[PDB]
Design an enzyme around this catalytic site. Sequence first.
Site, PDB file in Angstrom:
ATOM      1  N   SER A  48      55.652  44.700  27.607  1.00 25.02           N
ATOM      2  CA  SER A  48      55.861  43.403  28.201  1.00 25.02           C
ATOM      3  C   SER A  48      57.326  43.037  28.401  1.00 25.02           C
ATOM      4  O   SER A  48      58.087  43.263  27.447  1.00 25.02           O
ATOM      5  CB  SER A  48      55.327  42.288  27.259  1.00 25.02           C
ATOM      6  OG  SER A  48      53.916  42.288  27.220  1.00 25.02           O
ATOM      7  N   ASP A  97      55.558  34.785  35.767  1.00 22.82           N
ATOM      8  CA  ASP A  97      55.808  35.217  34.393  1.00 22.82           C
ATOM      9  C   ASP A  97      57.218  35.789  34.243  1.00 22.82           C
ATOM     10  O   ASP A  97      57.440  37.011  34.273  1.00 22.82           O
ATOM     11  CB  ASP A  97      54.742  36.223  34.007  1.00 22.82           C
ATOM     12  CG  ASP A  97      54.805  36.612  32.534  1.00 22.82           C
ATOM     13  OD1 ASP A  97      55.505  35.919  31.759  1.00 22.82           O
ATOM     14  OD2 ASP A  97      54.106  37.602  32.246  1.00 22.82           O
ATOM     15  N   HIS A 126      55.909  35.215  28.959  1.00 22.54           N
ATOM     16  CA  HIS A 126      54.866  35.300  27.938  1.00 22.54           C
ATOM     17  C   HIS A 126      55.414  35.946  26.670  1.00 22.54           C
ATOM     18  O   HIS A 126      54.783  35.757  25.618  1.00 22.54           O
ATOM     19  CB  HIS A 126      53.615  35.992  28.454  1.00 22.54           C
ATOM     20  CG  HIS A 126      53.677  37.494  28.402  1.00 22.54           C
ATOM     21  ND1 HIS A 126      54.015  38.198  29.548  1.00 22.54           N
ATOM     22  CD2 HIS A 126      53.432  38.426  27.452  1.00 22.54           C
ATOM     23  CE1 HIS A 126      53.994  39.499  29.276  1.00 22.54           C
ATOM     24  NE2 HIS A 126      53.650  39.658  28.002  1.00 22.54           N
TER      25      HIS A 126
HETATM   26  C1  LIG Z   1      45.445  38.903  31.302  1.00 19.01           C
HETATM   27  C2  LIG Z   1      44.950  40.070  30.403  1.00 19.01           C
HETATM   28  C3  LIG Z   1      45.630  39.988  29.002  1.00 19.01           C
HETATM   29  C4  LIG Z   1      47.142  40.059  29.180  1.00 19.01           C
HETATM   30  O1  LIG Z   1      47.542  41.082  29.733  1.00 19.01           O
HETATM   31  N1  LIG Z   1      47.942  39.053  28.745  1.00 19.01           N
HETATM   32  C5  LIG Z   1      47.430  37.959  27.905  1.00 19.01           C
HETATM   33  C6  LIG Z   1      48.668  37.033  27.971  1.00 19.01           C
HETATM   34  C7  LIG Z   1      49.828  38.045  27.782  1.00 19.01           C
HETATM   35  C8  LIG Z   1      49.394  39.221  28.708  1.00 19.01           C
HETATM   36  C9  LIG Z   1      49.653  40.535  28.001  1.00 19.01           C
HETATM   37  O2  LIG Z   1      48.942  40.841  27.051  1.00 19.01           O
HETATM   38  N2  LIG Z   1      50.651  41.319  28.474  1.00 19.01           N
HETATM   39  C10 LIG Z   1      50.847  42.576  27.722  1.00 19.01           C
HETATM   40  C11 LIG Z   1      50.400  43.725  28.637  1.00 19.01           C
HETATM   41  C12 LIG Z   1      49.084  44.204  28.544  1.00 19.01           C
HETATM   42  C13 LIG Z   1      48.678  45.241  29.370  1.00 19.01           C
HETATM   43  C14 LIG Z   1      49.568  45.804  30.283  1.00 19.01           C
HETATM   44  C15 LIG Z   1      49.061  47.007  31.226  1.00 19.01           C
HETATM   45  N3  LIG Z   1      47.949  47.596  30.904  1.00 19.01           N
HETATM   46  N4  LIG Z   1      49.776  47.342  32.266  1.00 19.01           N
HETATM   47  C16 LIG Z   1      50.870  45.335  30.380  1.00 19.01           C
HETATM   48  C17 LIG Z   1      51.283  44.293  29.554  1.00 19.01           C
END
Ligand SMILES: CCCC(=O)N1CCC[C@H]1C(=O)NCc1ccc(C(=N)N)cc1
EC number: 3.4.21.5
Lengths: 10, 27, 250
Positions: free
Chosen positions: C198, C99, C43
């Site tokens: 991420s 992912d 992602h």
């Molecule tokens: C599915 C909920 C939204 C989400 O997390 N998505 C939408 C598609 C990409 C991914 C993201 O944003 N990853 C970043 C992220 C966000 C939160 C965390 C956490 N709280 N551990 C980790 C990575």
Amino acid sequence: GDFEEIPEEY
Amino acid sequence: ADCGLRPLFEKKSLEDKTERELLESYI
Amino acid sequence: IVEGSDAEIGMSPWQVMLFRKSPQELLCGASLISDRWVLTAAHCLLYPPWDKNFTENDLLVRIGKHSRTRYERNIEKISMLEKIYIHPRYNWRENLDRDIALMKLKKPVAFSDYIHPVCLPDRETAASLLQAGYKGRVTGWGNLKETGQPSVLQVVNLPIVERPVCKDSTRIRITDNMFCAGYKPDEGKRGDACEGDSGGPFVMKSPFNNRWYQMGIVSWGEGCDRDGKYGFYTHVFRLKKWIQKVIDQF
Ligand SMILES: CCCC(=O)N1CCC[C@H]1C(=O)NCc1ccc(C(=N)N)cc1
Ligand code: NA
Ligand code: NA
């Protein structure tokens, strides 16, 4: 932006 | 071969400040 | 990372920063798994709902870093990408299943006190370590809270959570290629990954051979460090077959 620019070579 | 062994920690037999929290949870 | 702390120098020498060339900015975390291969979240590279589709030439890898913003002369190394590989069954349409992405560097990077690869789990290490209550560690330069940015790499240790608690915390469909981690409200302690973290690694130190293994990749979460919610990680061992094939063919 908050980032120090990097060497032009990269 | 050498993966996972950090030069400034495992290779010097030095521990980081919180790795023992991990070890203590492997119960 | 929310409710984490500043990393020690060289504490996470496999940590990689994915960096946008223009406008020059952090895109994501990542990890070094050999002198020419970097592991990340798919992602970070491909996410059509957000009009994200990066190619090799849009990016750089920065390895050996500590400071988020500074150019760490004589310490970090900056590398160009030869090729990106995304899992062919990465499910960006539904739940971010599988992912995971590999990035091959144009030239090998030189190992140092601050630059060194993490191990990837074998089946026996994964079986032994991926258990509810067992803690791993997440690192990253992402946001410090859900709604600024850190001056240096952050670290937080988090317990793996049981699959039924993971599933009951969300309306998203959870798969075997994911696991979740973090404290329960009941547990007091807190912490989480967040945006910008991420693609970075969830690592555990094997008590059998004292080596660090990357068990997860920071993948998704609903908010950051919310009570009753948990962060979700790509299950690296479950996808290792794909990793090996990519590396073995390329
Ligand atoms: C599915 C909920 C939204 C989400 O997390 N998505 C939408 C598609 C990409 C991914 C993201 O944003 N990853 C970043 C992220 C966000 C939160 C965390 C956490 N709280 N551990 C980790 C990575
Ligand atoms: Na559910
Ligand atoms: Na939480």
